[PDB]
Design a protein around this ligand. Structure first.
Ligand SMILES: [Mg+2]
Ligand SMILES: [Mg+2]
Ligand SMILES: [Mg+2]
Ligand SMILES: [Mg+2]
Ligand SMILES: [Zn+2]
Ligand SMILES: [Zn+2]
Lengths: 61, 99, 1333, 226
RNA sequence: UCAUGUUCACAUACCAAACGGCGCGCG
DNA sequence: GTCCTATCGATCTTCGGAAGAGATTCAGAG
DNA sequence: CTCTGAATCTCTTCCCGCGCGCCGTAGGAC
């Protein structure tokens, strides 16, 4: 997977999707949390985008 | 040709250019308008500081990459401090300001 | 140090000393055997700092324990050698010295402040004359340079009750003498002391300057140096080269000049030399510091080789090799590489292959970050070796590092955003970068050895930006126009054309099949030919009104290959898109409709499948090319043999003198055109004619499988203009000055050119190459000027709240519509509620985005004009609101708040900049514009108006043609008549301006005499004549002031009136005029009393945006009412406008040779056209307003792109206009604190007005004023961004005397200092920062 | 994220401890003594609670790391639930001495916990002998119980919301030493001097504890939403 | 039921290539 | 042969850029 | 007698990358 539009359906500003995907990927890489989506050893780059697909992320979290 | 890291010029710490020297490709003026025309701000910030010019940040970046931390500290490029001194070497007091 | 603004000012001497760590004394650098820096020279380690890493020069201390001790062997400080690049020193000059910049900027800041001419202060400063100060009880003035003769006078005509000095001390004294505020308080009153424009404005400059020196902290003496700072030595290093030689390191030769001169001047001062000697050395010193600051603004630049000028400081700041362009704005970067690109057909659209050698030499930091994480290497020290050895594990690690790390590929130049894109890499054995075929078109990457650079993004944020924004899958559309960029590659479309043709005879033709799959089994086993006709069962899918699929099924009649191709289409399109022989346009719309109906994610995969398919069937097609396939129509031989004799008919007339030398030529070239069209038509018919085949009995024809014709008819490559030359005829050719050749190239490249036809052919091609190589500079300088004016814009509000805007129509001109409304209006937002054609029924709410289903709806209606918001009208301060910008073309929805629209527009104009060159029809009814008219005695409607226009409306209710019709034309159809296509609507004199009467009656030559006003001609063709009325250039005031007249007359003394008119039917004659109607002729209504006989490619856009006035500026009328003459032509003519009410005495000097559209009696408006020629935007803005100048500029620029076939959305031009007219000029200061007249940024006055209006005090009023971009950028309110563009020594001194301050709003300044731009993702951060506030 | 007085009264926050176990430093925050049991003044409680809430909300909005300290076995479940509900960090079981002051050691402990947990779930090692697995499991369980909430906290907290200062006094002291703001609920027996944002109220009653937790959670969540 | 124990003596310690013309060439 | 000091303070910097705009110099006159 | 017109001078700008190739203070005095 690569095209992020379905995540942009959820974060309706596209800039906020980069700020949110970075924040969440940092909670994984740096903050030591782990994903609510099943990871496949993807990069956090892709995991965080795959966490928007589960519909369970916004910049409240 | 390809370069991870190697030489830097003396007057300003940007990379050398060449194959006869182990140089980095010029992310020249038009490319910067091209990034600005996407929303891409962090890419640009990196490309013209951490990857390029900030004498601290690039060594902190390198270590964060070998550590795999994927994070940067961006600072302020030393070529721009060259500019300030080259203006302040005219009787023109240019200075950074706070508020 | 963290910061958040930048400030610039003049440095007072004590500040310059403060920056110093020492004072340089000796003219030296490093020794010439050993290489220690020679102490108190320009490198002295105790002035600036130690050379060795963290250890001292005298050797006494070499350990961090001593950090910050200062020795007493030589005196150096032991500290970080890094600080050797940080610390300055200074020179104490033995005299004051003028700083060249302030002496020779645009004006002179020195001279202007003094009111003293530049040449005269220079006459002091290079010691040519004295200047007199404190003149006391003597007959001498306040500055008043006096020659050494004239001082030697005063030395004994007066004692010393005055003074005069020479050299920079004298200017310093003069500046010090400034009672600066009191001079300003006077001068701002002396402003009013005349109304003399020719100094009120350069005095407005002077009264500005004084108040700027007052309002800063600055003081005037600081224009004069006294301590000269010297650059920190590491910035000017004296590096050794090949053996024991220092690189000639220019500045150290300039400071060496200075310090030598200063050493001498201190000597000769203290040894007390006489005036003539010290004026020598003092001149040579001032003339040397001149070198050090800005070498070559002197009379001549100084040199140390074969006249190479030494690069001085100001040559290091400015322009194309200096910091702002060379090292700040864009700079070299690590983690990058380049290679020759080559095509990789198997890639999915998101990938590119890059060589394992490069990936391994690029990703090294990440590879170490896995070998430590495997614990397979101990650390960098081992992993480095383990990579160098290229051990068998490293690739399995690399193929984990890279496994999804986007890499950025961009060619250079990179005109537009699509020119950098990101791809996921896949590894390759070779050394080329394997690029995806469809994407090469975006780059204008041809595959003929065209290198491309690659960059790795390092951080997590740089990967998230690359994947979300720049990945090729996200960019199927152009930024500039709603049109795909994935537009199929020529071979792909060749294959799909070949796959979908029908051939009327084929193997397996006419059977009936149950689906594509057995269509494929039928093809692949070789049982049916791919273009054989067939019937199949099909199924297709549609998404309903909710969006959910309905699946349907039927028999379809089709071909095997259209059945196979249907299998690639995603399940939601109708088969009617495939059921046709496909070609480049037809498949682009195919792909577009996929995006219309499904969306992106299916479209990128469908595009990939198209690519694979086209390649594979294009292979099987074996679509070769071969010389037996070039088809010559044998009629060509007859067509020449016919046309040759008809040209010789034109020649035989010429051989009898029976036709003119112009006519012979300009007709012969039309006979060759008539042959050429016939050869081309016969050849295209022959190509289609070559295929005919037996339909099992009797022959029948079908579309030709001829190799070159597939390629043309498919749109793969080489349409009509090429095949015409390959096998038709090459045709007419042009000379160097563009004038046409009398005997064309009747040959074609299937056959030979002889030597002359070939030699003339090169006059074409070498012109076309010279154009390419010459243009590629000016196009780039155009895009630079544009982004560097647009970069201040960012979309920054959702809806600014306007109800204002502009009106869109089809562009109706030259008859028919050159663009429909659906091009202009699609995806803007409505300005105001859009009604049903008719009345009172609204159709679109007042701020609705007119997306496609709304624009199709408008096309269902008889709408002609629609009002929409445009960025030129959006009342957001410091930006634009999103709704006013409208659709984001690369996304189709409304723009996102924060997007950098300015930069997108400038690139969108510049990308096609290489494609320019640097060198009644249908039945309808009459509608009219401005056309006040009368009927003649035959009853025919004759036009009496001169901004007259014609419109034609088709009976289904929409306007569809327009024309401009002269004054005194007759409307052959008037009175709302309907007319057939091509039924001649009007007639006019093609050669002269006519003058005609409203009344009928007798006439006289009133107030006229022969020889005084008219010439008693014979007219040689007849002997019975029409008289020549005298020109004001051929006759005196006794003829000029006797202005000739033709009043219609009756013994009543006045004519029968028009109701409510006092005016008699008095009429008049201009110069050159021809008059047949002498005294006592009875004149009818409509009779002509008399008759009066009478651009580029790219530059015509570059000079449009720079708003340069043309050579031939049409004189446009002003205010209103009626014209009159002023006083007649000598030196020039002067003419007048006088209103219905108010100021009658407006008069204007007017050129004689531009013939006038009015004479004396004509009703006129601000903006009516008094001569022909092109307009000038400065005046349009003054006379029809900002909306009218937008409409002008958008039209008159698109008329260049539409001519050359290029497409650009109109909004990307308004975004430049929005910037062109950002400045305003104060007419009333009202109660506001601007100067009583001032130029200001328009937002600044507007924001002051809105609050002052809320205070109810009198707001200011102004005109907006249109600067061309090359100036409207230098007038940005923020010196860094302007100074880094051009004219650096202007901006960087004008801003410096003002003491100006920069808040670093906008983009280019934040790039220079290297922080997040306040755009896009970085806008959203600046916004959150500004909201939590 | 304010709380109503009727709701507080209904919960039973006004109830305190016996009058003999009171702190005279809590004598200002006391209304009366009904049946030899102190009643906390809710009139003074609500504004204080609101002020604390506002500060917490601001911290959350600026992405502050709140740490919810609650060790009473009745309130341990509730505090843990609240913390995770508002994606924050908590300590529901015994506060380890020097969790914050001796952060570099408790950091090593967290690393150990993370490694053990990762091995348990993601490792899929299988080679456990039963003995090794049992030992590893015991270690994992103990670590999870003690440090499970702060495992993802990474560094030190920017604010410490604490249920009952007298019971969790060690934590209060540690926070004071470091200079981290404390927002403590303080019953009549507790001492309020170490606390920066005293919120008088019943630490004992479960409903009251839930109410305090829920309100705090709401305010932090609001800050996150921003 | 269980008394006594000669004298004097205790050590460590503050390091990996730089900048400008002139050209030719690629795009 | 090496070290130190200075430049055409007894010539001649190239005509083959256009432009395009400003600063700065001059008309016909009230 | 200098005021708005116009007239001659200088200053400033001229694509982006890239790769080679070479060539790199002098003269005089002690
Ligand atoms: Mg090419
Ligand atoms: Mg004894
Ligand atoms: Mg004893
Ligand atoms: Mg002893
Ligand atoms: Zn020392
Ligand atoms: Zn707007």
């Amino acid at each position: 997977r690569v095209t992020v539009q379905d995540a942009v359906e959820k974060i309706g500003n596209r800039f906020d999707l980069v700020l949110v995907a970075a924040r969440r990927a940092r909670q994984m890489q740096v903050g030591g949390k782990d994903p609510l989506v099943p990871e496949e050893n993807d990069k956090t780059t892709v995991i965080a985008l795959r966490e928007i697909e589960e519909g369970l992320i916004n910049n409240q979290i | 040709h390809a370069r991870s890291t190697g030489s830097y010029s003396l007057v300003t710490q940007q990379p050398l250019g060449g194959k006869a020297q182990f140089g980095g490709q010029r992310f020249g003026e038009m490319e910067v308008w091209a990034l600005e025309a996407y929303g891409a701000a962090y890419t640009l910030q990196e490309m013209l500081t951490v990857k390029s010019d900030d004498v601290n940040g690039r060594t902190k970046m390198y270590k964060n990459i070998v550590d795999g931390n994927h994070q940067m500290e961006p600072g302020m490029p030393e070529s721009f401090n060259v500019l300030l001194k080259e203006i302040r070497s005219l009787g023109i007091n240019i200075e950074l300001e706070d508020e | 140090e963290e910061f958040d603004a930048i400030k610039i000012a003049l440095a007072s001497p004590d500040m310059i000393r403060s920056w110093s760590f020492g004072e340089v004394k000796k003219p030296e650098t490093i020794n010439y055997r050993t290489f220690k820096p020679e102490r108190d020279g320009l490198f002295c380690a105790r002035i600036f700092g130690p050379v060795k890493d963290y250890e001292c020069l005298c050797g006494k201390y070499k350990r961090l324990k001593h950090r910050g001790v200062i020795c007493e062997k030589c005196g150096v400080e032991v500290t970080q050698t890094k600080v050797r690049r940080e610390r300055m020193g200074h020179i104490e000059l033995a005299s004051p010295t003028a700083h060249i910049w302030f002496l020779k900027s645009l004006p002179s800041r020195i001279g202007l402040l003094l009111d003293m001419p530049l040449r005269d202060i220079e006459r002091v400063l290079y010691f040519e004359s004295y200047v007199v100060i404190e003149g006391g009880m003597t007959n001498l003035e306040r500055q008043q340079i006096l020659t050494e003769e004239q001082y030697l006078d005063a030395l004994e005509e007066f004692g010393d009750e005055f003074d005069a000095k020479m050299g920079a001390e004298a200017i310093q004294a003069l500046l010090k003498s400034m009672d600066l505020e009191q001079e300003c308080e006077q001068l701002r009153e002396e402003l009013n002391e005349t109304n003399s424009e020719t100094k009120r404005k350069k005095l407005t400059k002077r009264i500005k300057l004084l108040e700027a020196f007052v309002q800063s902290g600055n003081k005037p003496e600081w224009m004069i140096l006294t301590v000269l700072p010297v650059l920190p030595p590491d910035l000017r290093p004296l590096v050794p080269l090949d053996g024991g030689r220092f690189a000639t390191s220019d500045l150290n030769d300039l400071y060496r000049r200075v310090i030598n001169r200063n050493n001498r001047l201190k000597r000769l001062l203290d040894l007390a030399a006489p005036d003539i000697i010290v004026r020598n050395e003092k001149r040579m010193l001032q003339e040397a510091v001149d070198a050090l600051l800005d070498n070559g603004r002197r009379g001549r630049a100084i040199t140390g080789s074969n006249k190479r000028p030494l690069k001085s400081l100001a040559d290091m700041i400015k322009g194309k090799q200096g910091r702002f362009r060379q090292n700040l704005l864009g700079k070299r970067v690590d983690y990058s590489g380049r290679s020759v690109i080559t095509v990789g057909p198997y890639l999915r659209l998101h990938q590119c292959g890059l060589p394992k050698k490069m990936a391994l030499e690029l990703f090294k930091p990440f590879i170490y970050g896995k070998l430590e994480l495997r614990g397979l290497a101990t650390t960098i020290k081992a992993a480095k070796k383990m990579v160098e050895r290229e051990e068998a594990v490293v690739w399995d690690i690399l193929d984990e590092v890279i496994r999804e790390h986007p890499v950025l590929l961009n060619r250079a130049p990179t005109l537009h955003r699509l020119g950098i894109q990101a791809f996921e890499p896949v590894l390759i054995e070779g050394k080329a970068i394997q690029l995806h075929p469809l994407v090469c078109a975006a780059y204008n990457a041809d595959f003929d050895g065209d290198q491309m650079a690659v960059h790795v993004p390092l951080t997590l944020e740089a990967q998230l930006e690359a994947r979300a924004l720049m990945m090729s899958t996200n960019n199927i559309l152009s930024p500039a126009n709603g049109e795909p960029i994935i537009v199929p590659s020529q071979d792909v479309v060749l294959g799909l054309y070949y796959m979908t043709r029908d051939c009327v005879n084929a193997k397996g033709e006419g059977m009936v099949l149950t689906g594509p799959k057995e269509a494929e089994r039928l093809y692949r086993s070789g049982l049916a030919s791919l273009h054989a006709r067939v019937k199949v069962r099909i199924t297709e899918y549609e998404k309903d009104a909710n969006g959910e699929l309905v699946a349907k099924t039927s028999l379809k009649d089709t071909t095997v290959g259209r059945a196979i191709l249907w299998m690639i289409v995603p399940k939601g399109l109708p088969y009617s898109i495939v059921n046709q022989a496909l070609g480049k346009k037809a498949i682009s719309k195919m792909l577009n409709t996929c995006y219309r109906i499904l969306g992106l994610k299916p479209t990128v995969i469908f595009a990939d499948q198209i690519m694979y398919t086209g390649f594979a069937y294009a292979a099987r097609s074996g679509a070769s090319v071969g010389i037996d396939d070039m088809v010559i129509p044998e009629k060509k031989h007859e067509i020449i043999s016919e046309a040759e004799a008809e040209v010789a008919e034109i020649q035989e007339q010429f051989q009898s003198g029976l036709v003119t030398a112009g006519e012979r030529y300009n007709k012969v070239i039309d006979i060759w055109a008539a042959a050429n069209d016939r050869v081309s038509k016969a050849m295209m018919d022959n190509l289609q004619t070559e295929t005919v085949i037996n339909r099992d009995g009797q022959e029948e024809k079908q579309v030709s499988f001829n190799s070159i014709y597939m390629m043309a008819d498919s749109g793969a490559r080489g349409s009509a203009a090429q095949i015409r030359q390959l096998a038709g005829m090459r045709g007419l050719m042009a000379k160097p000055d563009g004038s046409i050749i009398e005997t064309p190239i009747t040959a074609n490249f299937r056959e030979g050119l002889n030597v002359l036809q070939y030699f003339i052919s090169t006059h074409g091609a070498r012109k076309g190459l010279a154009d390419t190589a010459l243009k590629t500079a000016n196009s780039g300088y155009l895009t630079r000027r544009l982004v560097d004016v647009a970069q201040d814009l960012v979309v920054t509000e959702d809806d600014c709240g306007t109800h204002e805007g502009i009106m869109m129509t089809p562009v109706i001109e030259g008859g028919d519509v050159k663009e429909p409304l659906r091009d202009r209006v699609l995806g803007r937002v409505t300005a105001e509620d859009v009604l049903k054609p008719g009345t009172a029924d609204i159709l679109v709410p007042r701020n609705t985005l007119l997306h496609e289903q709304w624009c199709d709806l408008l096309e269902e209606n008889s709408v002609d004009a629609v009002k929409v918001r445009s960025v030129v009208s959006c009342d957001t301060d410091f930006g634009v609101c999103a709704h006013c910008y409208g659709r984001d073309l690369a996304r189709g929805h409304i723009i996102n708040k924060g997007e950098a629209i300015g930069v997108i527009a400038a690139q969108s104009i510049g990308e096609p900049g290489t494609q320019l060159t640097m060198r009644v029809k249908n039945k309808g009814s009459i509608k009219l514009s401005n056309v006040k008219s009368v009927v003649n005695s035959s009853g025919k409607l004759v036009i009496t108006s001169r901004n007259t226009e014609l419109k034609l409306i088709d009976e289904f209710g929409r306007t569809k043609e327009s024309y401009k019709v002269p004054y005194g034309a007759v409307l052959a159809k008037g009175d709302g008549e309907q007319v057939a296509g091509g039924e001649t609507v009007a007639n006019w004199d093609p050669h002269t301006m006519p003058v005609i009467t409203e009344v009928s009656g007798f006439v006289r030559f009133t107030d006229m005499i022969d020889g005084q006003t008219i010439t008693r001609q014979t007219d040689e063709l007849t002997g019975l004549s029409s008289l020549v009325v005298l020109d004001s250039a051929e006759r005196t005031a006794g003829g000029k002031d006797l202005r000739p007249a033709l009043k219609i007359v009756d013994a009543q003394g006045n004519d029968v009136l028009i109701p409510g008119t006092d005016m008699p039917a008095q009429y008049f004659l201009p110069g050159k005029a021809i008059v047949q109607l002498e005294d006592g002729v009875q004149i009818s209504s409509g009779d002509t009393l008399a008759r009066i006989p009478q651009t580029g490619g790219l530059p015509r856009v570059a000079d449009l945006f720079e708003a340069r006035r043309p050579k031939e500026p049409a004189i446009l009328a002003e205010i209103s009412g009626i014209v009159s003459f002023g006083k007649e032509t000598k030196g020039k003519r002067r003419l007048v406008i006088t209103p219905v009410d108010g100021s009658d005495p407006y008069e204007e000097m007017i050129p004689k040779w531009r013939q006038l559209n009015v004479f004396e009696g004509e009703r006129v408006e601000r903006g009516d056209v008094i001569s022909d020629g092109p307009e000038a935007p400065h005046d349009i803005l003054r006379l029809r307003g900002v909306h009218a100048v937008t409409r002008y500029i958008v039209n008159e620029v698109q008329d260049v792109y539409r001519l050359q076939g290029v497409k650009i959305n109109d909004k990307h031009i308004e975004v430049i206009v929005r910037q062109m007219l950002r400045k305003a000029t104060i007419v009333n200061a009202g109660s506001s604190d601007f100067l009583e007249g001032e130029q200001v940024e328009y937002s600044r006055v507007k924001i002051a007005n809105r609050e002052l209006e809320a205070n109810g005090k009198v707001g200011a009023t102004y005109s907006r004023d249109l600067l061309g971009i090359t100036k409207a950028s230098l007038a940005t309110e923020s010196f860094i961004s302007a100074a880094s563009f051009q004219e650096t020594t202007r901006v960087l001194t004008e801003a410096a005397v003002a003491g100006k301050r920069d808040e670093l709003r906008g983009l280019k300044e934040n790039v220079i200092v290297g922080r997040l731009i306040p755009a896009g993702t970085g806008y959203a951060y600046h916004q959150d920062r500004m909201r939590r506030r | 994220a304010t709380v109503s007085m009727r709701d507080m009264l209904k919960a039973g926050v006004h109830f305190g401890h016996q009058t003999r176990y009171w702190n005279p430093k809590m004598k200002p925050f006391i209304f009366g003594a009904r049946n030899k049991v102190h009643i906390i003044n809710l009139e003074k409680t609500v504004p204080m609670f609101n002020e604390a809430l506002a500060e917490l909300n601001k911290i959350a909005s600026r992405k502050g790391k709140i740490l919810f300290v609650g060790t009473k076995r009745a309130a341990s479940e509730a505090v843990k639930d609240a913390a995770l509900s508002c994606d924050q960090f908590f300590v529901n079981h015994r506060w380890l001495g020097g969790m914050l002051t001796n952060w570099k050691t408790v950091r090593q402990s967290i690393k150990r916990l993370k490694d053990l947990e990762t091995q348990s779930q993601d490792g899929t090692f299988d080679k456990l002998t039963k003995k090794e697995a049992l030992m590893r499991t015991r270690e994992l369980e103990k670590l999870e119980n003690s440090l499970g909430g702060i495992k993802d906290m990474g560094g030190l907290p920017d604010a410490l919301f604490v249920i009952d200062a007298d019971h969790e006094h060690i934590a209060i002291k540690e926070a004071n030493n470091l200079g981290i703001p404390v927002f403590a609920i303080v019953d009549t027996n507790s001492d309020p001097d170490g606390v920066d944002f005293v919120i008088p109220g019943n630490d004992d009653a479960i409903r009251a504890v839930t109410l305090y937790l829920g309100a705090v959670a709401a305010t932090v969540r609001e800050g996150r939403s921003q």
